[PDB]
């Protein structure tokens, strides 16, 4: 129950926006920590100079307008959210062929009370 009210409080289109990125104190840079994880190199079509890999890329960033008082909401720590609604710093290959650029799944994201 309280999870639904939490989501409706955070995902308010009138209160929260998606197209603008967070920043405070005179447009401070938002650090985005990303690291890659190789699942399995599935093929190397050496004739076409194409390498096909399965990748898990993890991304961390601080965001302030998403915080909430954890005490009021039954002392919840982390909440799952969809990716299509909360802002996200785009990170994509450049030397990618095939036209495909973005990720495939658009997973849910974990959000703590700190932000």
């Amino acid at each position: 129950d309280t999870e639904e009210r939490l989501v409706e409080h955070l995902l308010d289109p009138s209160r929260y926006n998606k197209l603008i990125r967070p920043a405070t104190n005179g447009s401070e840079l938002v650090t985005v920590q990303l690291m890659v994880s190789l699942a399995q190199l599935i093929s190397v079509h050496e004739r076409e100079q194409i390498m096909t890999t399965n990748v898990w890329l993890t991304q961390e960033w601080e965001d302030y307008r998403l915080t909430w008082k954890p005490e009021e909401f039954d002392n919840m720590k982390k909440v799952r959210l969809p990716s299509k609604h909360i802002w996200l710093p785009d990170v994509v290959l450049y030397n990618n062929a095939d036209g495909m650029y973005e990720v495939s799944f658009y997973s849910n994201a974990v959000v703590s009370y700190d932000g």
């Binding site: 129950d1 309280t2 999870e3 639904e4 989501v7 409706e8 039954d74 919840m76 799952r80 959210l81 969809p82 849910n108």
Partner: protein, 45 residues
Amino acid sequence: ETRAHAEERLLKKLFSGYNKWSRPVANISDVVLVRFGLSIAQLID
């Protein structure tokens, strides 16, 4: 009094205050159970 009319009223009342991403569970400590199965239609290649 038609069946489809009552079914439409059900569908109207059911989606009144329902959210999608909210994981539907009574208490936070409680869990869900997902019964899971496969069926092989055809082995392509």
